[PDB]
Design a protein around this ligand. Structure first.
Ligand SMILES: Nc1nc2c(ncn2[C@@H]2O[C@H](COP(=O)(O)OP(=O)(O)O)[C@@H](O)[C@H]2O)c(=O)[nH]1
Ligand SMILES: [Mg+2]
Length: 157
């Protein structure tokens, strides 16, 4: 009947809460969701945390180069200091917005560019992540896969 902890980490507005919705549907505040998934044949209780076996999803918006930079500049160190041996998956969110020509163009106008898959993978390597995945919560694209990989990874360590 085995069980897993998923912590979502990443800049505000990078799509964390929305990822959770789609999948499901002054103090610090943490929200915990009890979601059931079937993984490699068998059922698993997920406990997902938003602001025993564990895994961290370091999230960024693929159309926000800042949120990307912060995976490395701000979240990797935080994760590496506190959590020691807890597995990391880098998740690129809002992949639907690469198709968005205006946003791309507004990026291009400030010298920036949308984060590509290949580059997302590089980030993953430079942060010691066990994987890199992408999804769009808007199009329900690949969202369950993210949390299934998450589960597989958490249980495999
Ligand atoms: N286009 C698009 N927008 C999204 C997606 N996921 C979230 N958003 C939007 O991006 C903004 C921030 O979302 P949110 O989930 O609250 O980010 P969070 O603070 O990290 O939880 C909101 O306007 C969301 O509607 C997505 O997959 N595609
Ligand atoms: Mg949020």
């Amino acid at each position: 009947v085995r069980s897993v902890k998923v912590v979502l980490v990443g800049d505000g507005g990078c799509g964390k809460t929305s990822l959770l919705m789609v999948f499901a549907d002054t103090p610090t505040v943490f929200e915990r969701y009890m979601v059931n998934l079937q993984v490699k044949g068998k059922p698993v209780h997920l406990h997902i945390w938003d602001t025993d076996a564990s895994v961290l999803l370091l999230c960024f918006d693929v159309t926000s180069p800042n949120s990307f930079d912060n995976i490395f500049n701000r979240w990797y160190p935080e994760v590496n200091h506190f959590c020691k041996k807890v597995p990391i998956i880098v998740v690129g969110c809002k992949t639907d917005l690469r198709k968005d020509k205006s946003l791309v163009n507004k990026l291009r106008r400030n010298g920036l560019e949308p984060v590509t898959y290949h580059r997302g993978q590089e980030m993953a390597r430079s942060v010691g992540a066990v994987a890199y995945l992408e999804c769009s919560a808007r199009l329900h694209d690949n969202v369950h896969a993210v949390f299934q990989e998450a589960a597989e990874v958490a249980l495999s360590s």
